[PDB]
Write a protein that binds this ligand. Structure first.
Ligand code: HEC
Ligand code: HEC
Ligand code: HEC
Ligand code: HEC
Ligand code: HEC
Ligand code: HEC
Lengths: 221, 162
């Protein structure tokens, strides 16, 4: 009987440690947005480019939610949706009576094609969060290092509703820094460093353990 | 236990929520419910000039006639003007062609002309790219004042190849 006793003790450890390692993790998080916005029709079927709505990724650290002025310059001429886009779950009248909710937030009127003077913003639900001791900046992490826009937030164009893809818990930031390279070809900031040590030490360096990106004052100060 | 339609449980949230005011969240004290209060009219921050031509039919052709590009030849031949056209413009206008785009094939909305049909100067792009001519919108919210001129040189190179 001791063999099965040991087995159960080992299993017991497994189902405690595993629990504790999955406390501060928010994978596969899906709330209910007040509109039913679809990243699948816009970014996947129409092939709208990814930087269009989310425009602040190049300059600022917060690639924010697009404001309701971007929701009008495409949607002045699109009132109804289609006839070959409604599915088994979603009908045409579900979409047409919900694109009208975009007109109530801005104040657009369908009849005489003019703005009214009553505006209400849309309370979105933010699904990617970090505690506010970290310092992540989208600007020097997309424009400087040429990272593709699906390798951090998942294959976003194949989602009907939005889902958090990665876990963001401090051991995914370190792990992707161990196995990548800084871009030293184009930048003139690296001419003092990259032309050096090719004569002395080596051809290229990783990000984490060489430039110094694993120090407690560069990420949370 | 952890559900997926609600966030997961936490162990002593010491420094997780914010005492300061991170930009887009909701507050209670402000004028609206927002956190992005509008600046006062008529002020000027450091590194920005206000556009001095008003809206269409009286300031359109006045901008088309006498308005020039304040760039240099070092910045035009950089390739950054092409990359901004690759993002913000192929969805209606064509990439190498004019008017073919991605959305008159799918027939979602019609009425996008070519660049052979309408004669446009280098100052007449910048007046439309900030205001829009009856079916466009203000792309000033997306691009910056140094970057609208980088697009305008690339569009002139697209008309010359047509
Ligand atoms: C306009 C047609 C958009 C395009 C192009 C892209 N996105 Fe988007 N995104 C858009 C809206 C209106 C929202 C609001 C929230 C919602 O669920 O509708 C978003 C949100 C995101 C998010 C999550 C935001 C958060 O708080 O965590 C992500 C991660 C995101 N968008 C990514 C993303 C990518 C990778 C895109 C290129 C394929 C992209 N978006 C394009 C609207 C639009
Ligand atoms: C879909 C909403 C478009 C986007 C994205 C861009 N353009 Fe556009 N543009 C669009 C239409 C439907 C029209 C014609 C409107 C009309 O009333 O005739 C235009 C027009 C132009 C023009 C010509 C303006 C003129 O006075 O003749 C130019 C030079 C132009 N658009 C440039 C342009 C640029 C640089 C864009 C990227 C920022 C861009 N357009 C996007 C539709 C749409
Ligand atoms: C705010 C969110 C936006 C912005 C930035 C754009 N559109 Fe859309 N759009 C919007 C809503 C609320 C809906 C209906 C709900 C849904 O999930 O579909 C749509 C839908 C469309 C459609 C109709 C789909 C169909 O053909 O059946 C088209 C077409 C479409 N959107 C195109 C489009 C374009 C070209 C945009 C410019 C980038 C754009 N959208 C932006 C609201 C919003
Ligand atoms: C395409 C543009 C991208 C790229 C390549 C990445 N993200 Fe980022 N991401 C993006 C959007 C539109 C948002 C929502 C903005 C918001 O403020 O919620 C996010 C969000 C995040 C967050 C949460 C924001 C925060 O904690 O302050 C993090 C963290 C985050 N994204 C991380 C991240 C990483 C590590 C990326 C790798 C290059 C990355 N993102 C890319 C859109 C885009
Ligand atoms: C957690 C948020 C992440 C994740 C998941 C990734 N990165 Fe990294 N990254 C991050 C911080 C706080 C910094 C700044 C550190 C510093 O200034 O030294 C960086 C930086 C980089 C860099 C260096 C940029 C430069 O050349 O100046 C590179 C290169 C880089 N990050 C790449 C990279 C890759 C390929 C990732 C996998 C998608 C990745 N980061 C994830 C924070 C975080
Ligand atoms: C020195 C030790 C470091 C190093 C260099 C970095 N981190 Fe950070 N970090 C550290 C601790 C002890 C914690 C947890 C504190 C807590 O009360 O939970 C963190 C936390 C993060 C988080 C949040 C993780 C979560 O919410 O569960 C992120 C995200 C994070 N750290 C990112 C991050 C990045 C990008 C760093 C640069 C490589 C980095 N950490 C360094 C201790 C240390």
């Amino acid at each position: 009987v001791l063999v099965t006793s040991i087995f159960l003790l080992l299993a017991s450890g497994y189902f405690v440690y595993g629990y504790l390692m999955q406390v501060g993790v928010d994978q596969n998080y899906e709330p209910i947005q007040p509109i039913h916005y679809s990243h699948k029709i816009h970014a996947g079927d129409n092939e709208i480019n990814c930087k269009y709505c989310h425009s602040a990724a190049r300059v600022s650290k917060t690639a924010g939610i697009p404001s309701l002025n971007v929701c009008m310059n495409c949607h002045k001429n699109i009132s109804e949706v289609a006839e070959t886009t409604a599915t088994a779950e979603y009908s045409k009248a579900f979409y047409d009576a919900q694109i009208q909710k975009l007109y109530d937030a801005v104040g657009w009127d369908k009849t005489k094609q003019a703005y009214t003077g009553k505006t209400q913003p849309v309370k979105w639900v933010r699904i990617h969060n970090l505690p506010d001791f970290v310092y992540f900046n989208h600007s020097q992490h997309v424009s400087v290092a040429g990272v593709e826009c699906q390798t951090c937030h998942g294959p976003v164009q194949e989602f009907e509703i939005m889902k958090q893809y990665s876990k963001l818990t401090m051991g995914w930031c370190v792990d992707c820094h161990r196995k990548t390279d800084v871009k030293m070809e184009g930048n003139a900031y690296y001419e003092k460093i990259h032309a050096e040590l090719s004569k002395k030490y080596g051809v290229e360096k990783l990000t984490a353990a060489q430039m110094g990106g694993l120090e407690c004052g560069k990420c949370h100060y | 236990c952890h559900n997926n339609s609600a966030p997961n449980y936490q162990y002593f949230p010491n420094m997780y929520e914010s005492v300061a005011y991170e930009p887009y969240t909701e507050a209670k004290i402000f004028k609206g419910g927002k956190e992005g209060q509008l600046p006062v009219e008529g002020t000027i921050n450091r590194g920005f000039e206000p556009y001095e031509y008003e809206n269409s039919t009286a300031g359109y052709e006045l901008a088309k006639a006498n308005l020039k590009s304040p760039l240099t030849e070092e910045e035009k031949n950089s390739g950054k003007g092409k990359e901004l056209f690759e993002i913000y413009c192929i969805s209606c206008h064509g990439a190498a062609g004019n008017g073919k785009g991605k959305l008159v094939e799918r027939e979602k909305f019609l009425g996008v002309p070519s660049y052979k049909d309408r004669e446009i100067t280098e100052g007449s792009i910048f007046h439309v790219e900030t205001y829009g001519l009856n079916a466009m919108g203000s792309h000033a919210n997306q691009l910056s004042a140094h970057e609208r001129w980088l697009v305008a040189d690339y569009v002139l190179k697209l008309k010359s190849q047509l």
